[PDB]
Design a protein around this ligand. Structure first.
Ligand code: GDP
Ligand code: GDP
Lengths: 282, 370, 370
């Protein structure tokens, strides 16, 4: 029966495909998709952007710009929500759930997919920086004749704030997508499939600074992300109001390097972070 | 977002041709611009296949090549000819512009070694900032009355081109005699086309980070002035082998001092578990030196080779040693200034570059701010 | 723990190829550096298959052989060239070091008589101690204006190379006549390769001890001064049969006196039970004299002959009679000194080698200590 069950799947209708497909969509591994989904949603920002006429349709417009997908796997991307927002912050709650059928639902647990939604809302929140920060980099371009100390000293802040985001992202693009994927790909090749999958994702949420153990490391990240959003509000009528903001940024970043170091004595995953945030500095 | 290229002078049309050969080889595209049987997004460079090329003598031999189905000596004269055909040539740009879905940038392949294109290059960049103010422009200029035409185009490239990849023929020929033993033009460009091809590895193949031309440039170039880059390409074997062979001055395509930002592109299927280890050994041995003021790091991203065609790697850097190359040029100018309608444009050109040479030397000080 | 091998000079580059064609033959390695079908640990000399070699006119002769895919005459003249290609070769060496997992030593093949060797071999040993301080540098040097090149080099090998094995061409040319009947260089090298091959037998096959170059040398050299060895190859049958032929000076390539420590290597399948019986009769006969001051012992080790290719034998000897060969050379040096910028470096070199010959002549006394 089993030999006839597995054979029925290949020659007529791919567990190895579903994993390497959900990663293309949920974990945002496939570019030109997250850079097209998040880019659309961020163009708007209440009663709008919440009815099933825009957010249930922005996905069907997103997949066309993916250049990878549009397969039977590519469907079943219910872009639903789980909260009704009332009204500068760094939060926009929104889920993205995969869907499966019977002979595969018994392996991919209905709790494991729920944890993808946990790691997804973080990764999307990261894109909100590299777009808003890209905006001020593009918003300032049209300002160019106007060359003075007030101008050049201002733009050095962006290069100083962008680099911190482009390094914390480079970390995520190394742990949760490449090394944790090296395992569970050369690991597989029936009970084991449940545990191996329960160990693949669990390492993805562990190396992802979402675990409550290293939660204080995550709490400080919001202070960084918040100040960059304020920096986007002030798109030189109020230069000094921005000069104080950057000085708060350099303090918090200088505080992160100490709280991570003190948390080394008590986790080899965090070891690579200090080598990322610190390089020829203190 | 679509990318379009422009090739000027004799040099640009030559290396751009081999650039089109090597790139057409990466995908399953026959020389006759037809896909053969035999993932890779081929829409950024090709338009249904038709390449978005704009070619401005050798053109006759280019059509005489099997790839036909794939489409004076002063500076002021090169600038005059660009004005005489102002509207005639520009229509090609516009019709290719809006006919495209969403233009992202403008790749410019040209030489500044006294050619009619060298002036021709100076004119286009002025108008490209006039008409389209929301379109990035990148230029893969190449370095060698030659002092004159060289220093002049530098006046335009420092305020129009938001990025630049320098390639000096001098440091190239050193690689030619040493590791190819040529002792020609079509011989050195074989390696040059290789640098440009791998330079867009993250664009033609989708990845997580850096999925657009603004994704690569925005990290390195800190200010609209310090906007000069150099390249490296080691395969001519683990990760610690690649990055260590890149930082050597024997491989750099350039003839205190420190780096501002590095970008290393790995194209192989290497085990990604060791990429952090190589980063540790490079730090501890202190093989490279960075700026003291701001926290400057080195970034690496992975991609996949063309399955049709071994571990390759590209190194992209913004080194303040590039200031020395200018000093070699402008020094020749003062010597030619004393040896030979207003001759005033040559003054402001010499003036503005000397501001740039001041801007580099000021970046290496721990108090670069203010 | 891999060992990077370097080869300098004509003699050094010639013996290495014959050492390489011998080694890859013992394994199932095709001349195309590919494994053939046809347990043997092959990591110590090969990288994943390529040998970790760095070869430095004769190169053309090597590339013309079917093994192509396997990879003046004055002391002052040779050195001057070294400092001029200082940076060029170290990037070749450094990249091979970072490529290896845990580099352990440096095997070098060069001839003191060979001009290039007397000029370039001497320069590396000082730089190798400067850059990498925690790496042993062992050389398979071979003794032959001729005395000058020899003594000047010995000044470096006594303070830089922490180990050394000497191969005298005089005794080798002799052995060629009596038991081989040749009368050229191309015939005597056959036996040279046999020595180097069997010298590293215990490392290429998994055993109990002797799993590193340190595992062999540390028992031989007690003091930083006494660092000269000698070899002996008998087969040109029990375990007692092979040892009685080792201690005869009729087979040792050499031209009171006593040893320091002996290392025996057996490449046959002899019964390892009667080896303790053989040693007892040797102590009874008292065939070799020893030092009374310090504790020493005679050692023996077993291995397996290459199956893809009967009992062989190689012995490592640390004899004080090797000091005589130095005296003969330095005697001729003083002979040319009285017959013919500062002429002072050749003066201090004669003094420091005086300490070496003194240390050995004082080693054969009951009061060698202090
Ligand atoms: N790097 C490189 N430079 C080239 C090549 N071909 C020509 N050049 C440069 O182009 C310059 C000659 O320009 P030329 O073709 O006379 O200008 P034009 O006649 O206006 O196109 C020389 O100084 C060369 O350095 C090439 O294949 N590679
Ligand atoms: N054992 C051995 N010794 C060699 C060989 N070739 C050269 N030699 C030695 O090298 C010395 C001559 O040095 P030479 O080759 O003229 O130095 P070069 O001119 O710098 O290469 C002689 O005294 C030989 O003993 C060889 O194939 N085997």
């Amino acid at each position: 029966v089993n030999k006839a069950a597995v054979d029925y799947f290949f020659v007529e209708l791919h567990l190895e495909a579903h994993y390497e497909a959900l990663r293309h969509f949920l974990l945002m591994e496939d570019g030109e998709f997250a850079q097209s989904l998040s880019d659309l949603l961020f163009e708007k920002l209440p009663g709008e952007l919440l009815n099933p006429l825009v957010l249930n349709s922005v996905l069907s417009k997103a997949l066309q710009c993916s250049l990878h997908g549009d397969t039977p796997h590519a469907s079943n991307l219910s872009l639903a929500l789980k909260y009704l927002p009332e009204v500068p912050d760094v939060l926009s709650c929104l889920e993205l759930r995969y869907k499966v059928d019977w002979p595969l639902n018994i392996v991919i647990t209905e709790g494991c997919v729920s944890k993808y939604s946990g790691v997804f809302s973080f990764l999307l929140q990261l894109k909100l920086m590299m777009w808003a920060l890209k905006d001020v980099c593009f918003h300032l371009k049209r300002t160019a004749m106007a060359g003075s100390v007030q101008f050049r000293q201002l733009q050095l802040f962006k290069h100083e704030m962008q680099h911190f985001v482009k390094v914390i992202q480079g970390y995520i693009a190394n742990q949760i997508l490449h090394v944790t994927w090296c395992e569970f790909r050369a690991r597989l090749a029936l009970e084991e499939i449940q545990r191996a999958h329960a160990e693949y994702l669990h390492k993805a949420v562990f190396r992802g600074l979402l675990t409550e153990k290293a939660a204080p490391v995550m709490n400080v990240i919001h202070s960084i992300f918040s100040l960059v959003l304020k920096f986007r509000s002030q798109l030189h009528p109020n230069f000094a109001l921005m000069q104080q903001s950057y000085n708060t940024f350099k303090y918090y970043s200088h505080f992160l390097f100490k709280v991570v170091t003190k948390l080394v004595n008590r986790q080899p995953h965090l070891e690579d972070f200090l080598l990322r945030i610190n390089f020829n500095n203190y | 977002r679509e990318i379009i290229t422009l090739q000027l002078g004799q040099c640009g049309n030559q290396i751009g041709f081999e650039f089109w050969k090597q790139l057409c080889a990466e995908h399953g595209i026959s020389p006759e611009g037809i896909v053969e049987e035999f993932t890779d997004r081929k829409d950024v460079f090709f338009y249904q296949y038709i390449p978005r090329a704009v070619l401005l003598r050798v053109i006759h031999s280019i059509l005489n090549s099997p790839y036909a189905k794939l489409y004076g000596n002063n500076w002021a004269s090169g600038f005059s000819q660009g004005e005489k055909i102002h509207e005639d040539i520009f229509d090609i740009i516009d019709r290719e512009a809006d006919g495209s879905d969403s233009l992202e940038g403008f790749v410019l392949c040209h030489s500044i070694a006294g050619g009619t294109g060298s002036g021709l290059g100076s004119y286009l960049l002025e108008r490209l900032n006039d008409r389209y103010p929301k379109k990035l422009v990148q230029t893969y200029s190449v370095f060698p009355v030659q002092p004159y035409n060289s220093l002049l185009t530098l006046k335009r490239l420092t305020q129009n081109a938001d990025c630049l990849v320098v390639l000096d023929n001098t440091a190239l020929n050193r690689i030619a005699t040493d590791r190819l033993h040529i002792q020609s033009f079509s011989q050195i460009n074989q390696l040059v086309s290789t640098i440009m091809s791998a330079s867009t590895t993250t664009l033609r193949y989708p990845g997580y980070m850096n999925n657009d031309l603004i994704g690569l440039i925005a990290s390195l170039i800190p200010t609209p002035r310090l906007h000069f880059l150099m390249t490296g390409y080691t395969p001519l074997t683990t990760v610690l082998d690649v990055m260590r062979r890149l930082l050597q001055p024997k491989n750099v395509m350039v003839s205190n001092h420190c780096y501002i930002a590095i970008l290393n592109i790995i194209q192989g299927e290497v085990d990604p578990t060791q990429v952090h280890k190589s980063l540790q050994r490079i730090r501890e041995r202190k093989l490279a030196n960075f700026i003291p003021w701001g926290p400057a790091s080195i970034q690496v991203a992975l991609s996949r080779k063309s399955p049709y065609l071994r571990v390759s790697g590209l190194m992209m850097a913004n080194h303040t040693s590039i200031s020395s190359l200018f000093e070699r040029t402008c020094r020749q100018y003062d010597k030619l200034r004393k040896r030979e309608d207003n001759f005033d444009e040559m003054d402001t050109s010499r003036e503005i570059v000397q501001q740039l040479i001041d801007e580099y030397h000021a970046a290496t000080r721990p108090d670069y701010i203010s």
